[PDB]
Amino acid sequence: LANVVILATGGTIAGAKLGVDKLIAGVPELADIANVRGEQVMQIASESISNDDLLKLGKRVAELAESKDVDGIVITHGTDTLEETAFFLNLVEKTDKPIVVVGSMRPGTAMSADGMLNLYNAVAVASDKQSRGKGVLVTMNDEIQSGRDVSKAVNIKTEAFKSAWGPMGMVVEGKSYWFRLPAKRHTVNSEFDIKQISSLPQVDIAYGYGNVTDTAYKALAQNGAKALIHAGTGNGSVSSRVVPALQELRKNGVQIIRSSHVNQGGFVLRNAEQPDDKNDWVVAHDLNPQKARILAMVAMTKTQDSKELQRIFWEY
Amino acid sequence: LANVVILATGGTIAGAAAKLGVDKLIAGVPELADIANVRGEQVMQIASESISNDDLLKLGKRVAELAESKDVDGIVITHGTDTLEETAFFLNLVEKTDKPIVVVGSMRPGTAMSADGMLNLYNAVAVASDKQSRGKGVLVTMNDEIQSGRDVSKAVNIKTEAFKSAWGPMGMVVEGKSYWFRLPAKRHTVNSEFDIKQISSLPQVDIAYGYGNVTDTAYKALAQNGAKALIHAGTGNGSVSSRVVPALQELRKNGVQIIRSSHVNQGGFVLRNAEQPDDKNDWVVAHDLNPQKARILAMVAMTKTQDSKELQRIFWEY
Amino acid sequence: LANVVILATGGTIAGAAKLGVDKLIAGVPELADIANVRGEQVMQIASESISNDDLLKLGKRVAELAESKDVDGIVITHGTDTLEETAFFLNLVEKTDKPIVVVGSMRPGTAMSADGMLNLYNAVAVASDKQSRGKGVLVTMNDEIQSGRDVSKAVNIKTEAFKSAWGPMGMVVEGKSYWFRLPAKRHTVNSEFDIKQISSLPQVDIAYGYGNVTDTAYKALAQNGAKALIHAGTGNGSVSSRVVPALQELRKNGVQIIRSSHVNQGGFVLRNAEQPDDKNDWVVAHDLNPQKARILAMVAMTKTQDSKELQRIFWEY
Amino acid sequence: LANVVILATGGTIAGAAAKLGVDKLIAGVPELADIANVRGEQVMQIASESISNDDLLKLGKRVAELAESKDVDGIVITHGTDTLEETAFFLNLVEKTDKPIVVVGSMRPGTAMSADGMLNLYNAVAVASDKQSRGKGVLVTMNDEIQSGRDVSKAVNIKTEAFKSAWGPMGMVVEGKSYWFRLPAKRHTVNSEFDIKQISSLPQVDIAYGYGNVTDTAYKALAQNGAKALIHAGTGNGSVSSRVVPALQELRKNGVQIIRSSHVNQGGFVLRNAEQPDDKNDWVVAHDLNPQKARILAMVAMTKTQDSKELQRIFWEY
Ligand SMILES: N[C@@H](CC(=O)O)C(=O)O
């Protein structure tokens, strides 16, 4: 049987009160499908995660990917920032070993609680040869989702996690069924490595909407942001009122990254709504504002060149 | 034939955004003359991502004058897509009329191959001319759909199907004809307690985003710059970082309404007292409304009340 | 507390369709907090094998419970395969404002993370709720309140199996109902149809359109007693060259021809667009998928044989 | 510039359906000259709902000779939307080439307002011309998307977003540029074991629907009239009424393959041995393939094997 480690971090799947040992006891069928062992990396509500928490989780994952005693890794996590952690690990963990991030929308105490099967399915996928080299996976709602572009898109319901580019597969009675492969750079073919990463630069997000001002953009840069993800309307559109503040912030050395709150499909096109070449801005392509923040943080451990940041938004 | 007035505000539907005047928009769709007697007004000429609260008030005031005119049966607003959903919701809350109000944009300018603007405008006029549209609240007619101005949202970039609601389209418009499948359940227009006739100004409301390692910085800065309500665009169920809760409690003590929305915009809603102790903090949940919609309702509402219980009731009924 | 009766019909919700209604209820003790619940076993079937006579029996029992002063709301537990056919049929023929809720599960209560427990809780919560009065028949899976009219089994395996092209009308969360849309189409109290009057349904069958299809399924189904054929066409109810002559002669010999599609996620079949329905005296099924259009074709033909009245019905329900 | 040949077959994309020649389709998109050296051929002029197996063989042999030509870089087929998905999957199985093959149609004719054909055709040529398309299998380029011809389906009537896949678009095409976000996982084109150069005819495969009170009649008449496989378009997970199981045991006993598909088409798939005992019956499940797509794959598989176990492998790899 495969050797799988579960790194627990908290979340509703642990309602964040249960320790990894009771999560494992909760799903006795795990022993039918893998030799499982757990660690408690942290116990948090994922809306409260820090950059310190990600670095600790990422270092611990790498240590396990380097052990020959570990065939696959499952991370139990809060749903609220599951997508951010999943994408982070996709960029920085240079391993073909299966990494599965999994949450639940209900606590194990609720009627029809989703955690038990989610965790069974995360271990099955963590144990499957088909998962090797696929990059980071999320195994909720009987789907295999890419950790790059899966997002918490529906509140309350168990089908919370969607990608604009579709599920890559499904998992049913412990069996993995593939229908698509990834096209963007991940894990083994990533240029980033958590091994070379000691700290993450500060990246914040400001929201675009009618009558918005430059207040959040200025205040976030004054308080440490090295890049601002603009969560614009439409195709990363920027108010004529705020454009001059973004110009001034870029000259001031802040990367201006044009994402959107248009998250079910499509992508932000360079030079369409704003003269990005002229302003030395970047477009976040299809990536939603919290995903763009992660790719921006990870990329700026390696470069501050707006041209290289654009290539990285076009490749990951 | 109904008397339909087209109010032009700009947008890609008038693009080469916001370069063609209403008379060339109308002259580009000669078939309008078959379904209605149309006339045009230029209310403004803007890229809608650049809208001000001043422009919104101006539009709500002009719509109100046309609605009470006996020579007007329906009103079409041509508009940029980027904040179409904000304007549509605003009109839905403040125009106390039964007459059809339709907001319409296009994802492609009229010069582009396979431009969506001509059929969109034809459909908007058809819908605004139709007795079925009366009393339905503000409607949006893109991609052959009749969408509620309340909860339809620009959810897909680039593609002509950009506008979605979590609760589906209410109907379709095909070859000029409206087909209804659902009716609105939330208060609007005729049955709203709000009225543009009594609204001349709007309180400042701003939005801040929730994500990993977020700080209280944006909330504090926005409140220092005049925000009377902060929309929290939370992760998950309006969830709030432990590092941010202290600042939201101070800001509420200071008289700033705290309204928990989310960036989980495909379905579901934010539940009172689930992720945060709203009753304890005297906060409001925004129910199913996305952050930009919650802003529009928050600021229409606070023309009338600062009581957080009334604001919660409004977020549950509108 | 509301008085709610559960009628059990089978389905994976009752899987180990092997569990009696008394076990289903006991397996959700929380039902005691939200209603006074009684169970009856109407039948114990896999819903893929349901018959017209199952439908009438279930409908006639629902009508008797609706007429009773001691019943506030009704829940039917049902297999998911034809849940959408039963829910539409009940929406057409039950003349009552009392809540009727149809419910199944995609996994048996024996499975890890079984969905049947919360589904039944939700069905009783919604059947108990005054908000449900006058709304027509409802389906309460995946935390949603779906219209029985146009909800369909659209996704295999997963618990979000039920979708409507027109979206969920609401949700049910911790036993409370949250409404966002109202039905537009005729249902229940405003229906011209009544299960009280119906003794037996006309025979109605369905044939599929596809490349290189022939007229064979259509003639064989009519030859074995179909009074109406639901064409499950490509595209906008499109009909092959090769099939149009056989459908014209069937119509000529009194078989109703109803143009549906296997294009089910949205849109509708438009009269006179792909085929000259006025000339052929055919009918379009509007938005209704083939199995839905079959239900409505059965109910409609208990009243009329006039193709124009059938088209009016397919435009109103 | 790339050499792209357009094989025209009819459809709404050529409507005044199937009335304009390939020259008029080329002339109505003058910008194609900017992106490729385009040449055409009228293969047939039909409403795609009337297509035959003869039409498919002739089109697959045409596509094969052109792909074999060193003066052709990519191929575009202009087609009716009703059976576009069947043709596309057919070609993705039988055309052993890394050269781009794009099937395209339109939901509105080019005379309608905001007609979708011009941009769809431009995009099909752009993708057919793109080095990124080589090796990807057959593509469909409608609604600014790049869809796999394997599993894209006409899922929405009337609207230009008609074509969807359960597994999402692979990419998008915007201002003639291709943007990829997934790759195919299933066997196609060059790694197919099937080849149009070896196929002179197709076995007869027919489709029958499952629903309440369904009987065995359709299954028996279709087999009596020549079917060698029946595609069972079941409720749920390929479920079969107990009124019908006996009839299908009989037909399989008499050599007719029985392939369990479903009318549950937005997601999941039909699981072997779950709803019916397929090992015991010697039946095949269609996996994620919808009934019309299952038929295509059955027909093509049945030109190389009558072994139900080999057919099931094929349903699992393609
Ligand atoms: N607030 C919780 C929600 C969840 O886990 O579902 C978390 O992310 O930890």
Ligand SMILES: N[C@@H](CC(=O)O)C(=O)O
């Ligand atoms: N930025 C433009 C885009 C559009 O109209 O599609 C606007 O909102 O005006």
Ligand SMILES: N[C@@H](CC(=O)O)C(=O)O
């Ligand atoms: N075949 C079962 C499926 C289910 O109930 O989920 C039935 O319809 O009875």
Ligand SMILES: N[C@@H](CC(=O)O)C(=O)O
């Ligand atoms: N009936 C037409 C429809 C279309 O092309 O959109 C066809 O398939 O030929």
